[PDB]
Structures are given as C-alpha cells and as structure tokens.
Amino acid sequence: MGIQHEFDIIINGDIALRNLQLHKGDNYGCKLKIISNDYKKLKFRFIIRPDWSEIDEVKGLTVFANNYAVKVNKVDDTFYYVIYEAVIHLYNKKTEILIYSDDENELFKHYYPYISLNMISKKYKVKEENYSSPYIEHPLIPYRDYESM
Description:
This protein has one helix at residues 107-110, and strands at 6-11, 15-18, 29-35, 41-49, 62-65, 68-69, 73-77, 82-89, 94-100, 114-118, 123-128, 135-137. The protein is mainly β and 149 residues long. The chain has one domain (1-149).
C-alpha cells in the first residue's frame, strides 16, 4: 500500500464530489464535463488531505477549462489539509475542465475520474471511475468547516 492521499471537490457549496483520490499514487485530479445554459460561472474548492509518509512536498493543482488556463488560488496550506479555489466562467454550453497535480503517462485516460455535471437537468454522474471510487453528494453535507461555502 503506497501513497494514499484523499481528494474532494466542492462546487458552489452545493455539490460535493467526494472520494476522488487515486487508490494509490502521489497524484490527484478529475476531469469534469459541465453542461450549462444559465450559469455564468462555477465556484470550486479543491481539498487535498495529504499522505505525508513518503512525499517531500504536496503537489499543487493546475486547472484548464476547454484548454484555457484558469487562475487557481491556494487558500489553506497545513499538514492535515491543503485547499485551492477557482471560479470558472463558462462561455459555451459544454466545457471540459481538467484539474490535476500532473498530466502525463495516461493519468487522465486510466487514473483520474471523469464526472459529468449537467446544470440544466441537474444530473450529476460518474462517467468513468478509472482508478478511484467517487461519491457524489448533493446536497452537500458539511462534515468539516472548510467544506461549507
């Protein structure tokens, strides 16, 4: 049993995408398909609980939306949790968001989950679990203070 981080993403304080971590490995990420007519923008909070048993530092996150670079802000950085935020603006009905620590060696193809969030029909679903076991919670139940938005 190698490196086991935990990785969650909260959207709009309403939707929690929990348990997104890779089953093992020093990386964490998610691919999102957003379908929308009405949302001008989505607020994201990306929560990492790092496994410090082997690492020297906690990898940060890169975010692209339809392959345009998105501003990412680190808002907490502690031993037990490292938290990032972004507010992503939607310019097309369909937007692919790539969130990751690293994007190499088929991580998106075989490892990171792929989740669809249809904001029109309000249908939130896992398209591919790959090497993770996502749990989509809606409405979100805040189990930690840093989960509520």
